[model samples]
Target: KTHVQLSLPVLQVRDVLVRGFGDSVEEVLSEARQHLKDGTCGLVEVEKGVLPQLEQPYVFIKRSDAAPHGHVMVELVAELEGIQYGRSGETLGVLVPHVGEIPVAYRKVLLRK
Candidate 1:
């Protein structure tokens, strides 16, 4: 497995109550599964204290899979590194007002099951 180290002052994983979806993680997971099956993406907030308390709040992207996976698949995106650029070529952060997909170099891999 390949790993990249990140040095953030604070990073924590906590149960999130996605607004407008449900009140618990279980509900969120179930909702995400259905959405993924319908070829949709679920974007929810990580609740307060679940992530860096940014001005725009912490957002979570939960995507489901069709096939049963024995190994985890990780997508290393530019947004994850907080280096996403805008149309004017300006760096953006989690607090950015407008959100859009950034051009990324995706590397795929296969793991033994």
Candidate 2:
């Protein structure tokens, strides 16, 4: 899947699982993202049919038999940090095969950073 022509430059994790759901989950997530706090997690809703990209940062939620129909949710968490993944670049290949320096989501979703 691909994404919209233009996209935000937020550091994201690919399809992390979400445990809780139901009414106003998006609102709760929005509050966290907008809350004047540190290390808040953000949520994104995704539909299976309109999958943007396998690599595109998104929330991927599984569906149940009766619930097997709707959007998946992906989360964006942590700070943005770059690793040489570069002299360094080639070295990372053994650990995480990639061509250039990658922006890693480097942290945990704690109340504080």
Candidate 3:
């Protein structure tokens, strides 16, 4: 029930689950680069499963990490059909695995520093 909603420009959206890199953009970048090189970028999942609630229809970038030094980053995108999103446009829901969840969203750059 604890998550952080974030508002970010979604470069692309997908239904498939991409390897997550925790909350590290570097990790994400590295994976993205690898995927780009391997031609698997299309499998990246910028959003996640059904949300717990729709108070603001925010995106939850959980603090959960995937295999092989991967992590998940959530973005708020409404254009993509069959997916959930926040309509408030003011805040996002981000979930930190160890830190629990929050009402507002955060940027990967902010967490890097």
Candidate 4:
């Protein structure tokens, strides 16, 4: 009898930062899946025609559930307006390179997720 598992989902979390994991596909998934929960890493794709043809390839990302975030949507909504960055209800973590996490309130970008 064949031990075939049915309903196995085709993993859709595309690799933007995922590389170097050669043949160890399962390993990469574990790492990426872990990254998602910690919010340390995520997948995001630019919406179509948002910047219409200037000449660069596009990328995509998705979480463990295999569903991509529909909003945070590159802020490209046609009717959407106002500032897109800085404390405008989007708190960005102050992750300092090499120096590590920046917990300072004043220097931090404060906003709600």
Best by TM-score: 1
lDDT of 4 by residue, 33-110 (tens): 344335443222234533232111211121211112232211111111232221122221111111122222221111
Q: lDDT (CA) for every model shown?
A: 0.26, 0.24, 0.29, 0.22
**What residue runs in model 3 are displaced by over 4 Å at the alpha carbon?**
1-14, 19-21, 43-113
Query: What tens-digit string does per-residue lDDT give for candidate 1 at 1-113?
Result: 23221111111222222222233434443543343334332222235553353322222331222212232232211222343221122211111111222212221211111
lDDT of 4 at 50: 31
Stretches of candidate 1 off by over 4 Å are 1-20, 42-113
Report the Cα lDDT for candidate 1.
Answer: 0.26
Ranking by lDDT: 3, 1, 2, 4
The local lDDT score (0 to 100) that residue 36 gets in candidate 3 is 31
lDDT of each residue in 1-113, candidate 2, tens digit only: 22111111122224323322212434333343343133233223333533233222222212211211222222322211231110111010001111222334332211211
Q: Distance (Å) between predicted and true CA of 89, model 1? A: 30
**Which of the two, 1 or 4, has more TM-score?**
1
RMSD of 4: 16.3
Quote the lDDT for 99 in model 2.
Answer: 20
Per-residue lDDT over 41-101 for candidate 3, one digit per residue giving the tens place of the 0 to 100 score: 3221233643322212222332332222222333222212244333323223322111121
